[PDB]
Amino acid sequence: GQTVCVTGAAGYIASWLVKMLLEKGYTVKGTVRNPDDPKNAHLKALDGAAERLILCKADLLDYDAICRAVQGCQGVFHTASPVTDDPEQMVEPAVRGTEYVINAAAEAGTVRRVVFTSSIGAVTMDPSRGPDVVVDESCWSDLEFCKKTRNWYCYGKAVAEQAAWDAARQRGVDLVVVNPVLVVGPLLQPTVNASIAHVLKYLDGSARTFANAVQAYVDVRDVADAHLRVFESPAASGRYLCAERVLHREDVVRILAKLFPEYPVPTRCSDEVNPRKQPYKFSNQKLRDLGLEFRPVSQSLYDTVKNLQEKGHLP
């Protein structure tokens, strides 16, 4: 019976974090732009929301608004963040917004641990990285490479994380980070987020081809579960990579064609001339060591399409 804060509580990954929290007798203070906007309707109907959900009005760049939500809480889950390649609304709002939380939780005075939601964008983005090496928590991105290629979401997450590590040390608050990859799964929120858009663009004919690239995948519930496990585990420390497996673009559109042949999923590749990129080795032992059984991607991709259809996003 403790109290915790979750920023951007009505987000894709966040909405699942609240459900799990509310189900274990946690009081959840959910920061949103407007507690009475319809966007948050899907939070007031959870088993424990009426009793222990409290929607706090707060922008992420409003220091005082954060302190109001963070105050009285034993833990904080900073999930809110911009998700875009526009650096003007990504980079500084992420570092300032993140530093506000650490300070606010450090400001006063019950918080034993903060959990920041970083990204894989601050891990695997380094072309100097070898093909043989296992991508683990000690892997960081080349910030110059991100800047040269306009990868500002990956940039912002890297800086926002390192800023959180600094801010945490400077103020002496317990921090532990979770690095989810491209997340996918059932949507609780009524709107389509950025990661689902990468999945949905195959199923609505937005794409007639798929790129010659690779990427890691994880279920949204595996993420929400990770944040909760890394928080409750006392000895939990450092970063925590959160992924199930690495797939090629081809392997993805195959799984979707497999279970959904009535949709116009791509079959042809954008390259077809250079050798297809092979998936990279990675480690998710830190989360597994905490007793986390990852849901298969294929199983998670299915619940997504079934969810999107039920909610009108797909015919």
Ligand X SMILES: NC(=O)c1ccc[n+]([C@@H]2O[C@H](COP(=O)([O-])OP(=O)(O)OC[C@H]3O[C@@H](n4cnc5c(N)ncnc54)[C@H](OP(=O)(O)O)[C@@H]3O)[C@@H](O)[C@H]2O)c1
| CA 195 – CA 64 distance, rounded (Å) | 31
Amino acid type, 286 = K
Cα→Cα distances 201→68, 125, 240, 256, 304, Å: 39, 23, 29, 12, 13
Q: Please, what is the minimum distance in Å from the beta carbon of residue 183 to ligand X?
A: 3
Q: How far is the CB of 233 from ligand X (least distance, A)?
A: 20
Token output for 209: 């081809």
Does residue 164 bind ligand X (CB under 6 A)? Answer: no
Cα 217 → chain centroid: 11
Tokens of 201: 């663009």
Please report how close the Cβ of residue 93 comes to ligand X at its closest, in angstroms.
6
What letter does residue 125 receive in the DSSP assignment? -
Residues 60, 15: Cα–Cα separation, whole Å: 17
Kindly determine how many residues on this chain lie close enough to bind ligand X according to the rule CB under 6 A: 25
- Tell whether residue 79 is among the known ligand binding residues: yes
Q: Is 119 annotated as a binding residue?
A: no
Q: Choose between 17 and 253: whose C-beta lies nearer to ligand X.
A: 17
Angstrom distance (rounded) from CA 155 to CA 167: 18
User: Residue from 4, 5, 11, 226 that binds ligand X (CB under 6 A)?
Assistant: 11
* 90 counts as binding ligand X under rule CB under 6 A: no
Q: Is 44 a catalytic residue?
A: no
CB of 89 to ligand X, least distance (A): 9
- Out of 40, 98, 103, 119, name the contact with ligand X by CB under 6 A: 119
Q: What is the DSSP letter of 84?
A: S
Question: 115 — phi, psi (to 5°)?
Answer: -120, 110
Within 13 Å of residue 140, how many CA atoms lie on the same side as its CB? Answer: 13
Instruction: Select 119 or 151, whichever has its Cβ closest to ligand X.
Output: 119
| Contacts for 76 with CB less than 8 Å, ≥ 6 apart | 4, 5, 6, 7, 70, 101, 105, 111, 113, 114, 115
Catalytic residue among 19, 29, 157, 286: 157
Q: Is 33 annotated as a binding residue?
A: yes
183 annotated ligand-binding residue? yes
Backbone angles phi, psi at 173, to 5 degrees: -105, 140
Q: Is 8 in the site for ligand X (CB under 6 A)?
A: yes
Find out whether 60 is annotated in a ligand binding site: yes
By CB under 6 A, residue 40 contacts ligand X: no
Work out which of 33, 112, 277, 306 binds ligand X, going by CB under 6 A. 33
Which segment (67-75, 78-86, 98-106, 132-140) binds ligand X by CB under 6 A?
78-86
Is 7 known as a binding-site position? no
**C-alpha 74: how far from chain center:** 22
Contact status: 182 vs ligand X (CB under 6 A): yes
Applying CB under 6 A, the residues found at the interface with ligand X are: 8, 10-14, 33, 59-61, 79-83, 93, 97, 117, 119, 180, 182-183, 193-195
Q: Which residue numbers belong to the known binding site?
A: 12-13, 33, 59-60, 79, 157, 183, 195
Please list the active-site residues: 157
